[PDB]
Design a protein around this ligand. Structure first.
Ligand code: PLX
Lengths: 55, 56, 55
């Protein structure tokens, strides 16, 4: 995690990709920054109005 | 260091300190589908120096 | 898929089947007093039907 604690191997990928993380491969730490959607305009009736407009 | 249980996205996240590297590790628990012994099995899978686990 | 994760839908479905299992095993809770009477009544009715057959 970006705070520095490890993430256990039973954590799902969909919970992992909601924030940044660090990936250690041998000794190099790559700071992975996934493309995340907003969480301010993520009121669920607005996100459903986005799914309705797109479909 | 303490053991902290917080809630993220409706799931409990428990942050416990592993002995062999002395760094914390957060476990995401599922309150209906999971049991105690599968949490202890994940806790022994994350670090092999946790031969003795118990919960009281 | 980013709404299936932040709303915690899998635990909602397992909560739904846990509610169904609890309602089913609580409908079988108030039945077990009644079948102890029903088995008695059906037994002492078949014991009178065999009387008229042999008669
Ligand atoms: C309750 C305390 C115990 C009482 C103990 C006393 C019992 C007294 C007997 C009462 C008799 C009831 C049973 C009836 C047995 C008669 C058998 C009958 O088949 O005999 C016929 C002779 O007939 C009899 O004399 C009476 C005919 C029946 C009419 C009265 C009906 C009584 C029914 C009362 C309800 C009880 C349930 C019936 C149990 C089977 C000759 O056979 P068949 O000619 O070749 O029939 C052709 C076969 N079919 C029907 C399939 C086409």
């Amino acid at each position: 995690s970006p705070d520095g604690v490890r993430v256990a191997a039973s954590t799902g990928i969909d919970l992992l990709l909601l924030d940044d993380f660090k990936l250690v491969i041998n000794d190099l730490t790559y700071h992975v920054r996934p493309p995340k959607r907003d969480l301010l305009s993520h009121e669920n009736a607005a996100t459903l109005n986005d799914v309705k407009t797109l479909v | 260091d303490d053991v902290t249980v917080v809630y993220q996205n409706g799931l409990p996240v428990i942050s416990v300190r592993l002995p062999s590297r002395r760094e914390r590790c957060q476990f995401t628990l599922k309150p209906i589908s999971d049991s105690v012994g599968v949490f202890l099995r994940q806790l022994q899978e994350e670090d092999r120096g946790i031969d003795r686990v118990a919960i009281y | 898929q980013q709404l299936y994760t932040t709303l915690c839908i899998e635990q909602h479905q397992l909560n739904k089947e846990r509610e169904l299992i609890e309602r089913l095993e609580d409908l079988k809770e108030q039945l077990a007093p009644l079948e102890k009477v029903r088995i008695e009544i059906s037994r002492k009715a078949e014991k009178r039907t065999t009387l008229v057959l042999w008669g």
